[PDB]
DNA sequence: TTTTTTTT
């Protein structure tokens, strides 16, 4: 009998795998009898144990094929093709709705019975982040809607304040939530053309730590990047399409994606100040620092970095109506979980602890 | 049975598709039983719902093929082959006529039953455009004739004015109208080689915001652009063929397309000035700004960037006689539709509101 | 009859071989009659004499094959696929356990019947290393655990001391034990970006011989290393992912590995100082250089640079329960072997010889 | 009836051919009958006439094949695979053993029954070489052992001497004997890195007359060598692995091979002095040049840069016991020829003619 | 029935054709019936008419095959393979002897019944060129032998003089006579580094206007000749071999070919001067110009550029015994046919017309 | 494999 290339393509679709070697390696594991597969028995990896029993029969025949890499390439192409279609057709709401479904699937596993994570420790993260800025949950919801509508000029946000004020911590969580890339515009003017190539097909971008100049009078080290951004007007305004370049590839034309800019207290030209919708000032606070000392599991597990943390904040704080209609059904079930898991006094007491600078838990 | 490679080629032809991945993805959509196809039922994409029912049977057999990417490669080459045949055998007038027929097809959707656009909003955009320069519609018509005739050493128009005077706005609409590419000349002398490669087989090009030198007397930056263009004379002149380059690919040879140059008020070599046919000055105007502040749905929907808007302006203003004979029938039909939906007084009222800096739609 | 590709795939897996030529060459050796095979009789290479008999028949048929290289390419892909899967799914603690099993296999060879090394000479190396810093074994155990947990901010160790004070030596041994790469960051600021591409998918890095500035007052030749690091805080803190560049390749995004920093006695910014978990001071000591000078077989055999010496040290000093569960069996066997091969007085004397600076062995 | 691919593969192993074109060209010769093959009859080339009569029938069918280069590519892969195996499994002593057998095999034909050379000619070369520097054979034997043992630090000798000292001429013959390369450290230190990858996999290496980087102080043109090697220590001392690079290619790590520094008499830093076991400084000598001027034969056959002469120098002087154990028989089997045919007085006569600068032969 | 690939391969060997497009073009001509072939009847090209009848049958079937370029590729490889076998194995004299046979076979045709040129005009060319410098035939005989023996240092000669010195005229004729290749030395070296790959497998190479600062006294620009060659002294010496570039094929290790350098009478370093074991100075004379002016077929038919003219000159002047041995029957055959047709007095009077600047004919 | 990117 013969290999079903179809069953491989279904697995590649369902795992969303798009490295040929990873696809190859995964599929080969299934050739042993799932009935005794230790990975199955220990429930170690969903992409294995959910699928081993189904694909076992075909994996055995695949193991005898002489065409193995060809089968994988065709499968992987199917996954890549689906992404091209989606990018050229989905609405930005649907894109975001997909991204949330992916995160919610991880949370189902992660706070599942097999899952490692402690929902309490992750809720401690939410209390800390909600403390980082006034009206934090509203600020997130505003940012998200701004990215979805992607209204020209009204597109870009500025994070400003001294080193160790958490701005990159928040940027990373947002970037994890939406998907996107960091970029570094401090380069000399030539290499920028490949930097910007990273933006190709992304949903967000984040500009790291753009060094101004003259602020070294206040110990802020001088750099080029502010002048470069001052010269990247159309990329920021997003009004017309632009051409983007990768190594060994011909240029590609699209609307440059929206995003975030982060900096120390350099002085900003009014030309550039005009382009940001919103400036958010970050400032350091001792009680957060003292709390972190006592609450170190937050850092150890990277909780405060994680888009998973922000999604819990949204689920906790914001009305069911605000979420895209299809996932509202899942959202209700998560609100129901959290309501069972915490009384509001539990949550409030945590926030109080953080404000005291005491360890979050008591 | 076997896959019909012919039917796939037909689908590629009729969608004018020329990405192998997009084609593959699209064709695989059809493999599911047509009758339940939610994309069909919700009438989401004509590129799908027109074709699914027809292609379904062959799509199922295609889904089993071990050879899928080779089948798609042949179809994509057929679409590319037709483009090259046409590029070597059409008149410049015919090319523009075909391009216009395409925009007119897109307009059927925008204002059709699916009707996602509002024709009143898009007609508001035309009012703002007809304010941007004296005799705007006459200027557009003169440029179109210039591009069709393609008279050697009389092929290029110069736009200059302050920043925020409107240059790239108007270039963007002309470029969508005719089809073409933007190019950046502010580069080191090596990178120009691959950069100018982009012009291959295009109808227009636009050289974007060419930087001069000594412009700091006007608080401009300075850069390569002007001294660099002063070398590239024969590309402007278009009297003789030239040899054009792509990455990993051999030099093509053709006449370099006609086009537009944009800049701020750098001072220009009189030699380069003599190579331009026509210079158009742009100036900021307060009432356009105040009108825009009160009319921002123009920006939000990119109306004033869009080639559809320039086509609508021509249909409103120009005699049917000026249109190429084949499309005069469609032009007459669109004129009747516009005359039905708008009085002159309504259009006059809009234009008067713009002159007063009011929101257009009172 | 026909070639079994499966048998070649097994050999490639069992030998963990990932060069197509290395694989091809060795498999061809099996075609000659194993029953006489001088390599087998002289028990020279395990990867041969363990396998020759088993694979013999298939190797003979493979010797006739008309497509040999395609077989070997498929086999090598299978080995590479296993690495990709493991890279993405193992815990760091399992990676180290695997890294240990590999070395224990090679030790079973070195000190086995083939006897190509003397365990007593290697134990001399252990004693000399143990005297290089107080509580050396506890120091090494702490270092390994630190790399295994990879707790953010708590990630980097600093080695200071005069030249020829062993800091390179110990780093080399640790790197041989764990796997990883060195890096040089005394470069100018631009080319650092390609340098840091080295770290992609490594377990450790060593920033080797960072030049400071102004140390040249103590004849420490000055350079940009220190100031480059003081920019790189985000990579060191390890709290969020970063983008790494390779030549002719796209960026790739990951957590930046933990590592070690070595320098002569330059000054440090307090900012940089705060990023280190622990500082270790190296001082040159006369009895060590004199003992080396009278025990030079150590150097000649490159013993003291070798991770095998570190593994022997851990086994000698540290409890079985402290090792990962699976390998505790091999640990027990090796303890028993070493205990039988060395009474304490032997080791005590060897240490005391080092203490006297005389040749270790007298 | 069909081409045996195996017979072609044997011939490739037999010849050790590793160029697909050479293999193809030669094997096609065998299609004519060996019975009148004039190359066979005139005994022109062994790699033909030794094999034609065996391979004849297969070569006829080979000449009718349609796949000819495909057969030959597989055969070249076999020989390259063989090298890859040996290059990784053996140690330096067996490598040298095989290396000597190769040159001994050649001498066993050059002075063989063809008479196509007379060893007498080479003995004049041997005399000139033994006059070149004292105790010459022992200096070679010491260097050979030194480069075999590759003991750390003790890895480099410095040649020194002005133009026409012969230091290049010597290094050439040693590289002929060993295999290895020379390297231009006087390259500018940023580009220099892309040459260092030449050292990959090399048994032995040489540094080309390392220029004082302020060397023109001695009226010797300056170059980066001494600046670089003042710094780049353990590439020479070979204690630990270091990393090396090529243009458009990856880095690779190795122990940097042992070798020879050469210099014209530039200023040398103490760092760079410490690298050397030996710092042999030597002169152009007048009778030597006058000898060659009267002993032109030695240059006419390039003898004084051929390692074949060094092998003969060792064969004459060195005891049989000093050589690799099995080939000691071949050492006897040469000493029989030399010590028969040339008296030590005849040998001393040649050395004396050299010492007098007289034409070596009378 | 089917194409004989063997018969095609014979034609490629017969023609010594080694371009796959040329070969394909050639063979397809034969598909028409040779019996009426105009080219045959016209006796237009020997490469055709000698072969059309023989190959017609096979060409007819070749014309229908669906893989014609595969046949031609294998055939072309057979020709390239033959060259590689000869390249390594032949004596330099034997190579030169083959080259002469080829030229003599053309002279059979040129002065044959085809009679497409007259040895009258060519002998006028001989007479003209025998004026270019004293005893020209004898000077060439030295250059040939210097090249055949290829003795180290004794491998390069320098032509010197003004412009219009004929030095390129002489270089051209020698390169044709040998079948060498050409190179320009005067580049900034890292361009030339890859270009030098051309030198692979060549009997001879030549360098045009080896120049430098030694002519900027006369304000003639410093081409990097004198810059490069004092470094590249080894390549002129030819004492030792080196590795050389190609696209696609592996780098090839060879000695450099011996060759020629030329200059427009710049200075030379004495270090470099030593490599020009001859140097010869050339200066214009007006009567030679007037002769050309009155003998213009000398230039129009390129006679005075052509190696054929040198071969004619050597046949006239040199003794039969001075040639390579086996061709001397052909040497005698042409020496007869020459003096059979020319009295010395006519040849001498031709030379006297040249010396007078009279048109050679009478 | 080159090429474009590296490399400069
Ligand atoms: N608001 C805050 N007040 C005090 N400490 C803070 C605050 N935010 C962050 N921290 C501390 O600073 C550390 C680093 O935070 P983060 O990386 O986000 O700072 P940053 O100022 O945005 O950095 P950078 O500008 O270098 O990207 C945190 O791990 C935490 O210990
Ligand atoms: N003539 C104008 N008067 C007032 N506002 C204008 C005018 N033209 C453009 N604007 C405003 O400025 C924005 C920028 O327009 P655009 O980017 O085309 O102008 P530009 O700065 O002159 O062009 P470019 O970037 O090509 O040099 C417009 O979107 C509109 O909001
Ligand atoms: N503690 C020590 N006391 C004396 N000699 C030492 C000591 N440690 C190392 N050595 C000697 O120094 C040599 C070099 O060691 P190593 O490279 O590890 O030193 P280092 O301090 O890291 O030097 P550098 O920074 O100059 O590379 C060793 O091979 C040994 O000969
Ligand atoms: N000891 C010697 N006595 C006399 N002549 C010598 C001696 N050694 C070399 N020569 C002459 O010098 C020529 C160049 O030799 P070689 O390249 O080996 O010298 P080198 O000292 O390495 O020079 P450089 O520093 O210029 O590279 C030889 O071909 C030979 O003619
Ligand atoms: N001996 C000569 N007397 C007079 N004119 C000569 C002589 N030799 C050559 N010429 C003239 O010089 C012209 C060019 O010759 P050639 O190219 O060989 O010169 P060249 O010195 O090598 O030149 P360049 O340095 O420019 O390449 C010839 O066509 C001829 O007209």
Q: Concatenated DSSP letters for B163-199?
A: TTSSHHHHHHHHHHHH-EEEE---S-TTTHHHHHGGG
CB A324 within 8 A of CB A96: yes
C248 CB inside 7 Å of strand F: yes
**Could you tell me the two tokens for A318?**
């914001």
Ligand 3 atom closest to the CA of C170, numbered from 1: 18
**Could you tell me the two tokens for B171?**
């270039």
B249 CB inside 7 Å of strand F: yes
Distance in angstroms (rounded) separating the CA atoms of residues A123 and A305:
13
Distance in angstroms (rounded) separating the CA atoms of residues B32 and B44:
16
Running DSSP on this structure, what letter comes out for residue E323?
A: S
Q: E140-147 — which CB contacts under 8 Å span 24+ positions?
A: E140/E174, E140/E310, E140/E313, E140/E314, E141/E314, E141/E318, E141/E322, E142/E278, E143/E174, E143/E278, E144/E96, E146/E258, E146/E277, E146/E278, E147/E92, E147/E178, E147/E203, E147/E204, E147/E258
C290 is in an annotated binding site: no
Against chain C, the chains showing at least 3 CB pairs within 8 Å are A, D
Distance in angstroms (rounded) separating the CA atoms of residues C149 and C134:
24
CB B357 within 8 A of CB B291: yes
- Which residue, chain included where needed, has tokens 């350079």? C223
Distance from CA of C15 to the nearest CA of D (A): 14
In chain E, where do the E strands start and end?
Answer: 156-160, 181-183, 205-207, 242-244, 252-254, 259-262, 276-281
Contact D45 E89 (CB under 8 A): yes
Chain A: residues touching B (Cβ < 8 Å)? 5-6, 74, 77-78, 80-82, 84-85, 88-89, 151-153, 190, 193, 231, 234, 239-243, 248-251, 253
Q: Concatenated DSSP letters for C65-131?
A: -S-HHHHHHHHHHHHHHHHHHHHHH--HHHHHHHHHHHHHHHHHHHTSTT--S-HHHHHHHHHHHHT
Burial label for E243, CB within 10 Å (0-12, 13-18, 19+), is: exposed
Distance in angstroms (rounded) separating the CA atoms of residues D309 and D124:
10
Closest CA to E211 of E157, E283, E160, E264: E264
Distance from CA of B21 to the nearest CA of A (A): 5
CB D189 within 8 A of CB D275: no
C168 CB neighbours in chain D (<8 A) are: 234, 239-240
Which residue in chain E is spatially nearest to D61 when comparing CA positions? E6
Closest CA to E171 of E319, E307, E343: E307
- Which residue, chain included where needed, has tokens 């001082």? C283
Contact D152 C247 (CB under 8 A): no
CB D22 within 8 A of CB D80: no
Q: Concatenated DSSP letters for C138-202?
A: HHHHHHHHHHHH--SSTTEEEEE--TTSSHHHHHHHHHHHH--EEE---S-TTTHHHHGGGGTT-
Running DSSP on this structure, what letter comes out for residue A277?
A: E
Computed over its alpha carbons, how large is the radius of gyration of chain A? 24
Ligand 2 atom closest to the CA of B285, numbered from 1: 3
Chain C: residues touching A (Cβ < 8 Å)? 5-6, 74, 77-78, 80-82, 84-85, 88-89, 151-153, 190, 234, 239-243, 248-251, 253
B181 CB neighbours in chain A (<8 A) are: 243, 253
Residues paired with residue A175 on neighbouring β-strands, in sequence order: none
- Which residue, chain included where needed, has tokens 């497509």? C67
Closest CA to A324 of A87, A105, A96: A96
What's the residue count for chain D? 362
Q: Which nucleotide is nearest to C249 (CA to C1')?
A: F5
A190 CB neighbours in chain B (<8 A) are: 188
Protein CA A117 to sugar C1' F4 (Å): 47
Q: What phi and psi, each to the nearest 5 degrees, are found at residue C87?
A: -50, -40
Give alpha helix (H) positions in B280-327. 286-293, 297-300, 307-317
Preferred mutation among A21, A25, A179, A245 to probe C, highest tally of C CBs within 10 A: A25
B247 CB inside 7 Å of strand F: yes
For residue D276, the SS3 value is: strand
Hey, what's the torsion of the CAs at E336, E340, E344, E349, to 10 degrees?
-130
For residue D99, the SS3 value is: helix
**What is the bridge-based pairing of β-strands E259-262 and D276-281?**
unpaired
Contact D24 E78 (CB under 8 A): yes
Ligand 4 atom closest to the CA of D132, numbered from 1: 1
Q: Concatenated DSSP letters for E118-174?
A: -HHHHHHHHHHHTTSSTTHHHHHHHHHHHHHH--SSTTEEEEE-STTSSHHHHHHHH
Contact C78 A24 (CB under 8 A): yes
Distance in angstroms (rounded) separating the CA atoms of residues A220 and A226:
13
D194 CB inside 7 Å of strand F: yes
**Could you tell me the two tokens for C182?**
């060195």
Residues with CB under 6 A from ligand 5: E 132, 163-169, 209, 264, 284-285, 288-289, 292
The residue whose CB lies within 8 Å of the most ligand 4 atoms, and thus the one to mutate among D128, D136, D162, D166, is D166
**What is the bridge-based pairing of β-strands B242-246 and B180-183?**
unpaired
CB A271 within 8 A of CB A232: no
C360: CA distance to ligand 3 center in Å?
18
Closest CA to D30 of D58, D6, D66: D58
* Closest CB to A81 among B25, B184, B247: B25
Contact pairs from chain A to chain C, CB under 8 Å: 62
All residues at 6 or more sequence positions from D2 whose CB lies less than 8 Å from its CB, including other chains: D61
Protein CA D190 to sugar C1' F8 (Å): 10
| Exposure class string for D167-203: b at 16+ Cβ within 10 A, else e | bbebbbbbbbbbebbbbbbbbeeeebeebbbbbeebb
Residues paired with residue B263 on neighbouring β-strands, in sequence order: B160
Give residue numbers after which chain C breaks (C–N above 2.5 Å).
Answer: none
CB E271 within 8 A of CB E233: yes
Q: What phi and psi, each to the nearest 5 degrees, are found at residue D177?
A: -65, -45
Does A211 sit in the ligand 1 pocket, CB within 6 Å?
no
Contact E240 D26 (CB under 8 A): no
Q: Which nucleotide is nearest to A191 (CA to C1')?
A: F5
**Could you tell me the two tokens for C229?**
């690091």
Does C295 sit in the ligand 3 pocket, CB within 6 Å?
no
Which residue in chain B is spatially nearest to A228 when comparing CA positions? B221
Distance from CA of D2 to the nearest CA of C (A): 12
All residues at 6 or more sequence positions from C261 whose CB lies less than 8 Å from its CB, including other chains: C156, C157, C158, C159, C206, C207, C210, C229, C276
Hey, what's the torsion of the CAs at B226, B230, B232, B235, to 10 degrees?
90
Q: Note whether B touches A: 3 CB pairs or more under 8 A.
A: yes
Closest-lying ligand to the alpha carbon of E211?
5
CB A183 within 8 A of CB A146: no
Q: In 10 A of CB C209, how many CB atoms?
A: 19
- Binding site of E for Zn(2+), by residue number, is 37, 40, 48, 52
Distance in angstroms (rounded) separating the CA atoms of residues B74 and B13:
12
Q: In 10 A of CB B6, how many CB atoms?
A: 10
For residue C316, the SS3 value is: helix
Which value in Å is the resolution of this experimental model? Answer: 3.0
**What is the bridge-based pairing of β-strands D205-207 and C252-254?**
unpaired
Q: Note whether A touches C: 3 CB pairs or more under 8 A.
A: yes
B247 CB neighbours in chain A (<8 A) are: 248-250
Chain A: residues touching C (Cβ < 8 Å)? 19, 21-22, 24-26, 28-29, 45, 63-64, 66, 68-69, 168-169, 172, 181-182, 187-188, 191, 198, 246-248, 299-300, 302, 305
| Exposure class string for E20-31: b at 16+ Cβ within 10 A, else e | beebbebbebbb
All residues at 6 or more sequence positions from B285 whose CB lies less than 8 Å from its CB, including other chains: none
Closest CA to B307 of B175, B169, B148, B110: B175
Distance in angstroms (rounded) separating the CA atoms of residues A209 and A190:
19
Ligand 3 atom closest to the CA of C263, numbered from 1: 25
B160: CA distance to ligand 2 center in Å?
11
For residue C290, the SS3 value is: helix
The residue whose CA has the least distance to atom 9 of ligand 2 is B166
- Which residue, chain included where needed, has tokens 């450790």? C204
D248 CB inside 7 Å of strand F: yes
A277: CA distance to ligand 2 center in Å?
18
- C-alpha separations of C205 from B97, C251, C262, D246, E122 in Å: 63, 19, 11, 22, 75
Distance in angstroms (rounded) separating the CA atoms of residues E350 and E362:
8
Closest CA to A125 of A241, A299, A355: A299
């Amino acid at each position: 009998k013969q290999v079903s290339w179809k069953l491989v393509t279904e697995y590649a679709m369902e795992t969303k795998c798009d490295d040929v070697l990873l696809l190859l390696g995964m599929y080969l594991e299934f050739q042993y009898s799932f009935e005794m597969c230790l990975k199955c028995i220990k429930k170690e990896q969903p992409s294995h144990y959910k699928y081993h029993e189904k694909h076992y029969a075909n994996a055995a025949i695949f193991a005898d094929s002489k065409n193995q890499k060809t089968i994988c390439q065709q499968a992987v192409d199917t996954v890549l093709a689906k992404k091209r279609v989606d990018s050229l057709q989905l609405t930005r709401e649907q894109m975001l709705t997909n991204r949330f479904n992916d995160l919610l699937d991880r949370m189902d596993i992660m706070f599942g019975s097999t899952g490692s994570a402690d929902i309490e420790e992750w809720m401690a993260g939410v209390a800390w982040l909600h403390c980082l800025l006034p009206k934090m949950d509203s600020v997130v919801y505003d940012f998200l809607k701004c990215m979805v509508y992607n209204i020209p000029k009204k597109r870009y946000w500025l994070f400003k304040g001294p080193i160790d004020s958490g701005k990159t911590t928040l940027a990373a969580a947002l970037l994890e939530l939406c998907g996107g890339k960091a970029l570094n515009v401090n380069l000399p003017l030539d290499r920028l053309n490949f930097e910007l190539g990273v933006a190709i097909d992304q949903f967000l971008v984040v500009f790291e730590d753009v060094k101004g100049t003259g602020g070294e009078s206040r110990d802020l080290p001088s750099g080029q990047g502010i002048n470069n951004l001052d010269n990247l007007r159309d990329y920021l305004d997003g009004s017309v399409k632009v051409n983007l370049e990768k190594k060994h590839l011909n240029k590609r034309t699209q609307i440059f994606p929206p995003g975030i800019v982060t900096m120390n207290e350099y002085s900003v030209p009014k030309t550039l100040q005009a382009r940001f919708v919103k400036q958010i000032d970050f400032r350091p606070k001792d009680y957060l620092k003292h709390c972190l000392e006592r609450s170190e599991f937050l850092l150890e597990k990277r909780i405060i970095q994680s888009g998973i943390a922000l999604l819990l904040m949204l689920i906790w704080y914001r009305p069911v109506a605000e979420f895209a209609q299809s996932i509202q059904s899942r959202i209700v079930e998560w609100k129901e979980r959290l309501d069972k898991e915490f009384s509001l006094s539990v949550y409030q007491k945590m926030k109080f602890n953080v404000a005291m600078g005491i360890g979050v838990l008591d």
